[PDB]
Amino acid sequence: MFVPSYYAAARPEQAAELVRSNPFALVVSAVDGVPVATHAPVILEGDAVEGGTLLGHMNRANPHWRSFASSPDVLVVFSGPHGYVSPTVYATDPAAPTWDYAAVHATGRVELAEDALDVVERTVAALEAPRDPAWTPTPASREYFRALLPGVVAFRVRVRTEQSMFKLSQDLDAERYARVREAFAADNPGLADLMDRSLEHHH
Template sequence: MQDVRKRWHRPFARHLAIHRKGVKALFVPHDYREPDGTWAVDLARENPLAVLVTNGSADDGPYATHLPVIFQPSTEGDPEQLPGTTLLGHMNRANPHWRSLRDGMPVLVVFTGPHAYVSPSVYEESPAAPTWNFTSVHVHGTLRRIEPDRSADDTLDVITATVRAYESRFGRNWDMSDSIEYFRRIQPAVGAFRIDVTRAESMFKLSQEKDQETRKRVQHSFEQSNSRRHHEVAELMERLP
């Protein structure tokens, strides 16, 4: 069994080596590019449960963890594009992914936005094929760990900034004052980090390859749905230039 596992990992190790040599980009057909950088910023802000992806060893393979990610608070207002911004995130320090993280390592953060299945019945033409409309942002950057034993206040700042960002946007502006001491007690188990964003790719696949009449039929079908996610896709389609 051990020999089989080694043979299986050998080509995978070569793949990881290739990945480390070159920068991999999200494939985005021209039709599906975002109209401007604010679309990617908005998607990341409205869909902050992201996936952090990093390379592990040849034996471990890649790591991927779902976690909350926010923009570092700024007095300059909302950014107009992702490159040049700083993201804040945290995970459980018991997660093996945390132990694999190193300062200065390249990372990928994937944000997934509204998406929905498109049935060929909407096209009113034949032959046709089904598809899936979706939106996604891939963010590349450099990670910096925040060690609670050396910078406890910085870790607490990430926790409170995350609560503040999510309560103002998704919650009810809950007052965390009475819970700060509780945050301090659980803080040693929290692995916080910063990511300096170097580049980002976005894909907004919203039936742009179809003629305007067909796109409107797809949009209308989403508007008539009872699904909130379908309504979000329809709203993005309406915003397309």
């Protein structure tokens, strides 16, 4: 990923807010030199992505994790809101399209996590916390978790580098920008909100 200056994160906390808000991530590694990816829920331990630790799990029948000893460099991609920008919105002739989006790329070394039960219980709490009501596992469900454990492989990524893209049209002048934002406000309110947050000076 390459990040033009206009699409850099405005504030250092924005990468971590995106990661926490979008836990269904893409875990990418090199299996015999070719890329392989698994969609998995991944949570963040720590205040910042860079230097932080990611915790995830996948199916033990998914052979992807068997590579995590011989090829330990991994990339985890977290994806926020996104949307196509049609030249129709600009209302200018000569124009060209683009796609607006925010994403965080965390690269580091992967390792298997012995305490798989901890990883999945922490994932439950993190993903249920924004919901009302939140689901809290009963004793019967924690016992069920224990019965399920042979089928899971948990893992940790110690994040060495992070890269964040907030490609949200901030290069546009106000008239073309207003038109982009108004088009997303109707059909993609999450993206419009991200655009609003990208313009903040402090909060």
